[PDB]
């Protein structure tokens, strides 16, 4: 399932930068 | 408030972003976080890679036709396999993978906690967990704790081998099989004799260990040595001669360990390339020497079946086409594989007598399973391309194969090499920093200007 594998790595791949972005918005302790 | 308001910048730390982890040298809490989080990465990979291997695993192909390196490690411990290395049960592979993957979440949790939430330095919080790199007694104490932990780890292998199902023994009489080790080799003349063997051909230093009794007994010794050494370092402080010989700093200690791991990496490269006892060829594929020997065996068998008298067959050079003498007289396979006569493997040894390969046994006693094994190993020689085209460099595309031995030897040579570079880098820097000139020459006190000219 190439569509499933691509969706999985998309959400996994977005998770990292999402953490940085949420903390930048919250002016967190980056 | 300001971009520079924290201590996590070059302005506060003296280190640029690309050396940012050096900002942690004297921040024991965050540095603890980095270490625990990194251990989570190691454990994560072990778990996730195993599940990937198992998901892709076809149990009726050889492991070494499937790009597997972790399942061979589990199978060597006797889990999941039976006679000849056949996979009888994949659930142990599944368990190892899941438990590592689950454990990596715990380590990652602790690592992230200590890295960004817990106390940044530990000394104010706890004298036990706090430390100064310059406190030599505290350094040998933590060293000692970890020596004890390592010694226990070595005894877990022993316990597996002797009390919890045994190990896979490629040498088991009648054919490779899982075997419980009941008589580990304890005689130190044997155990430490390995340490004094030449590393050159026909000797091979510790890489020559060729039976599980020596392997298990060696781990009994290492376990007790490490536990004893750990107790020693908890109860002692470094002697004067050691104090004067070493640099005492975090970066110096890092450099010692880099040199140590580099050495171990090179040792591992040679182990997986030459040893077929703790790296069974059933799981890892034949060694380079093994597959070269197996080709000679294959055409000896074929040509002898056709009527050739392989003992008297003179090759084009005057040496035997199939059989010749080593420089000390032993009967060995001919052709280029003359270089590989130190090879030993369970499919070949039934043909070996006191003087080497035995012509009578060669004429009368070669079994079909030996012909099969030699053919299999000849055609799974550890040669192949970076894009995993199996064969010699001139091979056409067709066979998707690079031996696990090549993958494991090359990766660990590369890693061991850069870790030697890192040893030199950090050892030189630690010396310069302890002496106070790691940032450059003092213009007002340049040493060479106070030296006599050379001429």
């Amino acid at each position: 399932e190439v569509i499933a594998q691509l969706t999985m790595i998309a959400m996994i791949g977005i998770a990292g930068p999402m953490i940085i972005f949420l903390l930048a918005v919250r002016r967190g302790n980056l | 408030n300001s971009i520079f308001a924290t201590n996590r910048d070059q302005e506060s730390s003296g280190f640029a972003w690309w050396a940012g982890n050096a900002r942690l040298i004297n921040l024991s809490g965050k540095l603890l976080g980095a270490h625990v989080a990194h251990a989570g990465l190691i454990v994560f990979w072990a778990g996730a890679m195993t599940l990937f291997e198992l998901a892709h695993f076809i149990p009726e192909k050889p492991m070494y036709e499937q790009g597997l390196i972790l399942i061979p490690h589990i199978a060597t411990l006797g889990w999941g396999v039976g006679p000849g290395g056949e996979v009888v049960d994949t659930f142990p592979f599944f368990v190892v993978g899941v438990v590592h993957l689950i454990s990596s979440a715990v380590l990652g949790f602790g690592g992230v906690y200590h890295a960004i939430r817990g106390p940044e330095t530990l000394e104010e919080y706890s004298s036990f967990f706090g430390y100064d790199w310059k406190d030599k007694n505290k350094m040998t104490t933590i060293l000692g704790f970890h020596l004890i932990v390592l010694g226990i780890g070595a005894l877990l292998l022993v316990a597996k081998a002797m009390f919890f199902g045994g190990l896979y023994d490629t040498w088991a009489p009648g054919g490779g099989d899982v075997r419980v080790i009941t008589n580990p080799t304890l005689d130190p003349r044997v155990i430490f004799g390995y340490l004094l063997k030449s590393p050159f051909g026909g000797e091979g230093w510790i890489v020559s260990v060729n039976n599980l009794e020596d392997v298990v007994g060696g781990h009994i010794w290492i376990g007790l040595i490490c536990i004893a050494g750990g107790i020693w370092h908890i109860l002692t402080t470094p002697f004067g001669w050691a104090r004067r010989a070493f640099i005492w700093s975090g970066e110096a200690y890092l450099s010692y360990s880099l040199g140590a791991l580099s050495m171990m990496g090179f040792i591992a490269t040679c182990f997986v390339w030459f040893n077929n006892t703790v790296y069974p060829s059933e799981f890892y594929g034949p060694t380079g020497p093994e597959a070269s020997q197996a080709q000679a065996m294959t055409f000896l068998i074929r040509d002898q079946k056709l009527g050739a008298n392989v003992g008297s067959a003179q090759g084009p050079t005057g040496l035997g086409k199939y059989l010749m003498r080593s420089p000390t007289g032993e009967i060995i396979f001919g052709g280029e594989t003359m270089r590989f006569w130190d090879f030993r493997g369970p499919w070949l040894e039934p043909l070996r007598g006191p003087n080497g390969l035995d012509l009578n046994k060669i004429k009368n006693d070669i079994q079909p399973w030996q012909e099969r094994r030699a053919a299999e190993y000849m055609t799974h020689a550890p040669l192949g391309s970076l894009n995993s085209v199996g064969g010699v460099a001139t091979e056409i595309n067709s066979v998707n194969f690079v031996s696990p031995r090549s993958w494991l030897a090359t990766s660990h040579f590369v890693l061991a090499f850069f870790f030697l570079v890192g040893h030199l880098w950090h050892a030189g820097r630690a010396r310069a920093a302890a002496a106070g000139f790691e940032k450059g020459i003092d213009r007002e006190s340049e040493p060479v200007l106070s030296m006599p000219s050379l001429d």
Binding site: - | G201, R339, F417
Partner: protein
């Protein structure tokens, strides 16, 4: 026995002070204590063997190859020939031979030379660290030199180990070097290996950057001489002032390409000059050291196929034809079975 131990102890300290002295014309040091005898032994044996050694049975098939000048070689064809394939990786010092005549037939000189040589250059590397420490320098010149050391180690030690024989180590000679390269391409397709490609970028780029840096500094030397003097006399050894206008040099190079492609920071520039060739050579040394375990260059032989199934050749397939020509001809009397497996 009493204070005699102190007369021995200060004598040891005098020796230590001499060994580590910053005032010897050539620095000795503790690494030099190992380096000096091993390099002398390797040099002396190499010179004698290159001039006078008899032919060597490199491939263990009683087919001795002549390497020395007195036995019919010139500077280009001569070599010290690797030890016999019958020896393999076995350690073959003089005292393992029944005679010097046997030792010479079997390529003993090669092993003596390469083992002393490799100890020598590893200690030469340590010695570069050591003197920098005695002089109050930063320590990493030895790290740059680790690149050539890694490369020498790859061809004299790692590749023989992987292939199971010092008969496959690089010969100590000019034409023997080319032989090693050609057979290497046939057996590993090194040209198609990305670590060798990085090696080439390393040395092409190093030569480019050497010429670039040399030309840019030379272009902006400050006028301190007349036209009848070499401009080199405009610099005095140990002067405090810089001898060229780096603002002028940067102003040139920034307009040659664009401003931000040019270094204005001399320390960044010189780090780049160090790192580029050093990293390229590290990777090409790792190429040899990993093709030593037969993880070889990319293989695109017959990768392109038409709608019916006919192979459409590419330049990779033409490379393959050249590799085949070298494969089938090399060591023409040594193979009895169809595959060259080491």
């Amino acid at each position: 026995t009493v204070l005699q131990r102190r007369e021995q102890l200060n004598l040891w300290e005098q020796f230590c002070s001499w060994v580590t002295s910053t005032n010897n014309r050539l620095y000795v040091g503790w690494f030099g204590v190992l380096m000096i005898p091993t390099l002398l032994a390797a040099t002396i044996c190499f010179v004698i063997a290159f001039i006078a050694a008899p032919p060597v049975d490199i491939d263990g098939i009683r087919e001795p190859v002549s390497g020395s000048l007195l036995y019919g070689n010139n500077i280009i064809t001569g070599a010290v020939v690797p030890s016999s394939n019958a020896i393999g990786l076995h350690f073959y010092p003089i005292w393992e031979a029944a005679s010097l005549d046997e030792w010479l037939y079997n390529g003993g000189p090669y092993q003596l030379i390469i083992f002393h040589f490799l100890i020598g250059v590893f200690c030469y590397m340590g010695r570069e660290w050591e003197l920098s420490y005695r002089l109050g320098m930063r320590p990493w010149i030895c790290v740059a030199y680790s690149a050539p050391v890694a490369a020498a180690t790859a061809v004299f030690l790692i590749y023989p180990i992987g292939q199971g024989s010092f008969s496959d180590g690089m010969p100590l000679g000019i034409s023997g070097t080319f032989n090693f390269m050609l057979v290497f391409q046939a057996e590993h397709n090194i040209l198609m290996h990305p670590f060798h490609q990085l090696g080439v970028a390393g040395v092409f780029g190093g030569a480019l950057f050497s010429a670039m840096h040399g030309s840019l500094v030379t272009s902006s030397l400050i006028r301190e001489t007349t036209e009848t003097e070499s401009a080199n006399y405009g610099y005095k050894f140990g002067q405090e002032e810089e001898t060229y206008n780096i603002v002028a040099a940067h102003g040139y190079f920034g307009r040659l390409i664009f401003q931000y492609a040019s270094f204005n920071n001399s320390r960044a520039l010189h780090f780049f000059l160090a790192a580029w060739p050093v990293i390229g050579i590290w990777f090409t040394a790792l190429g040899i050291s990993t093709m030593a375990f037969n993880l070889n260059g990319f293989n695109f032989n017959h990768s392109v196929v038409d709608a019916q199934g006919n192979v459409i050749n590419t330049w990779a397939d033409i490379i393959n034809r050249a590799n085949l020509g070298m494969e089938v001809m090399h060591e023409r009397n040594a193979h009895n079975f169809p595959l060259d497996l080491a």
